[PDB]
Design a protein around this nucleic acid. Sequence first.
RNA 1: GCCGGGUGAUUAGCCAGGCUUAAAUUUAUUGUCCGGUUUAG
Lengths: 79, 228, 308, 143, 148
Amino acid sequence: FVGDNGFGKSTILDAIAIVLSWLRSNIEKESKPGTYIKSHEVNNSVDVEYASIDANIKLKDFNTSILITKAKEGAYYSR
Amino acid sequence: MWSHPQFEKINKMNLETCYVDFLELESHVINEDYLKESVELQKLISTLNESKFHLNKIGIHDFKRIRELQISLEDDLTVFVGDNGFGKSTILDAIAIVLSWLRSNIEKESKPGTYIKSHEVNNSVDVEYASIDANIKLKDFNTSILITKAKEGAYYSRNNELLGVKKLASIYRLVNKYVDNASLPLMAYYSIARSYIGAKTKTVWSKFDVYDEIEFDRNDFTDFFQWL
Amino acid sequence: QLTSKIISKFNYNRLAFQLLLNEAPKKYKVYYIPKRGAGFRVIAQPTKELKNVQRFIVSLLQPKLPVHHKAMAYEYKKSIKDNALLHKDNNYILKMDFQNFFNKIKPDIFFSKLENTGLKLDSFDENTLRNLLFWRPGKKRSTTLILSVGAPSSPFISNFVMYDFDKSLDDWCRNNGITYSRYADDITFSTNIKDILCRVPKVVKKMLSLHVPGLSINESKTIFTSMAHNRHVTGVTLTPQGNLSIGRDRKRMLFAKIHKYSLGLLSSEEINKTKGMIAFANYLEGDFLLRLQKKYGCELITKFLMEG
Amino acid sequence: SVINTILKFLPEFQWIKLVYGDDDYKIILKKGEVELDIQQLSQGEKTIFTLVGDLARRLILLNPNLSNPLLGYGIVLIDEIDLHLHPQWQQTIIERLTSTFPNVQFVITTHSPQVLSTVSSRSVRILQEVEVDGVNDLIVSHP
Amino acid sequence: VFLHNRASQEKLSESQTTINALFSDIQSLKATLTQVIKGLELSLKEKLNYMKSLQSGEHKFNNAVSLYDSVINTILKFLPEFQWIKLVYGDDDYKIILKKGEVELDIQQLSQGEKTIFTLVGDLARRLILLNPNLSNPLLGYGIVLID
RNA sequence: GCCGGGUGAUUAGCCAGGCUUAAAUUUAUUGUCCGGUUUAG
Ligand SMILES: Nc1ncnc2c1ncn2[C@@H]1O[C@H](COP(=O)(O)OP(=O)(O)OP(=O)(O)O)[C@@H](O)[C@H]1O
């Protein structure tokens, strides 16, 4: 990844780090919790309600997908 | 907390009917300007604003010392008088317990509140469970709630009734969605632990920080200083 | 012998009946129905092939199981009006109801009660009965059976089950001058004596624990009322004079509907809508049609009645 | 408004100020003719300071649109209102609490007869112990 | 707890050669040590201290049971409502049981009113019984107490 | 005394306009396509 900008290329790596943590937890024990998205990481714009991250893992021809989402406080709908 | 085809029934001006009418209307229109300027929203807001929060009555069965008892509370001021060991605190913790589920359901729906501890049920031989019931009246709208726990060692189940609180909380969240600076009710509890009173440089303040806990203890004093 | 009669009537071979016996507790459909207000309700209903063998079983078992005479639900020649006629001349009224009444009835208590009546049945009869009248929610390893509602055989079983409770509570309430009556999972008491209705909540709880284990009282639906406020019993209002009534709001509902009909401004759907309500009100009161004729005239009412 | 609200319950003080020190902030009072610090107050004044300050902060935070935020709705529960308070302050705490926040429901438990001398008869419930039918139980009686 | 164990072992006997048994236990501890080290040494010293019961050997008029009864009746003097107080052993632990009316209560279930009195009186009599090990009635020493 | 309930009559009529009557602090109307009750083709 190449370029300079205010958002910072580091944050993308953080997103991947969150996803892999869930995979590790389930290996240690069944249905063990992973790492959640804290409320202060959601965007502060007035037209947002929730944040999400989508990832996919390929193993030969075996495909898996994971979605992680969190909604702001006081939202009408939960995710 | 869902939609309906608005069964006609008979003419009425209940808050629930306005809530259902708005829910039915919003399922068709897509433009937000029309929704934000519709007359149904104005009716819902005016009805919610003029209504006054007021807890109506409470009943206790088999909880701590009290065996069976019902109270009615005035809308402005009530005082309990008694000696030591007469369950003056028990009523206050019962009310805090029932109010915690309403506090929880406003932050995010389907979120649990406070349960009954296993050592609160009565110590007599013939008891099997304990329960608490309450009722909240918004002028002409009535809700009720029951919380119960079975004694350890028994093999018969009991559940809770949480339709009323979930329905009431959905109205508050829906109004909060379409209004910039909508208000919220105030719930507080000043226990006997005010004696204990004697940072990361927070920069953002909102109305949802006071909903972290119903009781007052420790760091609230610290935050008061930072706020001042 | 019950399996033989079912086989003879429906012409079932050994293999087909064995398969039906094995797969019976899973032929149910779960769906939602809207609520008057806001919310939803959940129902479960069996298939067509199981319903008409449940009705046959009920018709076979009806003349052999006693039922108390104070239960006015799902009974022949009984209705709401006969329920309300008991409390029509008393002052103070108290109402209570249970908590998840239907799904607290299990085959253990059904067979326990059935053994006490003196009716002896073989192992085959017990096996066929257990696998035919009960529902199994959850996975195939649940091994839990409940009655549910929406099945033609549940109401009779529940009425037969609550016989002892009805009998024991009846003679306790009679000795203290209190009237008592039960409709499905609703119980009502009424009397004229002051400060006597504050003692029954502990009595009913003791009776429930003694005579039918498992059941319990929903404590958030207990009501006390007198002649100074609104009084009604299962949907019919009691005027202070002591007469049954439908309510002033519905009377003006119908008077306005008919007046708007006289101008020919009513859709065809509302005619069939209002005709049933008018018939029900006439049955409940007994003089609604006379008042309508005395106000709008027989020619218009007769034309409206014969319409459609 | 916050400062005067706090000063409403402590008539013996003159003003409250916030003074920036070299490395820290300080709250300075003035009692009589001597300036005081928040750590040099008695237990009673500390209790009143914390109670009123917390109530005002909660009300202001919850009602931003109102011109006067002290008129919100809600319910407040207090246990043993007469902690660390002399009888002179015991007689007037109730009417000041009710006058400052007029649209808030209050539930209060007390222990002493001094407060009972200044409450209407329609808002008093008295607990008692009575053995009925061989079982001891608690009852509530209106005056 | 310690005063109760001493009361049971000393006055109510049921201990036989307690000193010899404690010495044998210390000998077994030494044999195990020959066969965490600091903890084992501390336990061995504790066993020797227990074996020193014969060295102490007082069993005087102010025995353990007399002190236990004096403490219990002293506490019960300030709480007229209650009936009796006991120390119950169960689930490999000790707990305090109080009787009020017809219901037995633990210590967690009391109100603040009797919690304050029980704590203050218990600590005051603890210090009086502990700092005057020679008086016939230990609640007769001298001192100064400040209460706010 | 006051307030809150019951309702025959009244009105291009589900609002309103009148006359009666009731009282311990003390109801805020409910689930269909199943079951039984009412009417009808
Ligand atoms: N499980 C229980 N079974 C029976 N009685 C209990 C139980 N738990 C508590 N109690 C009773 O509760 C009483 C104290 O209750 P509570 O603390 O509500 O009263 P209070 O002294 O008026 O309160 P406070 O001083 O905390 O304001 C004790 O005297 C005890 O007998």
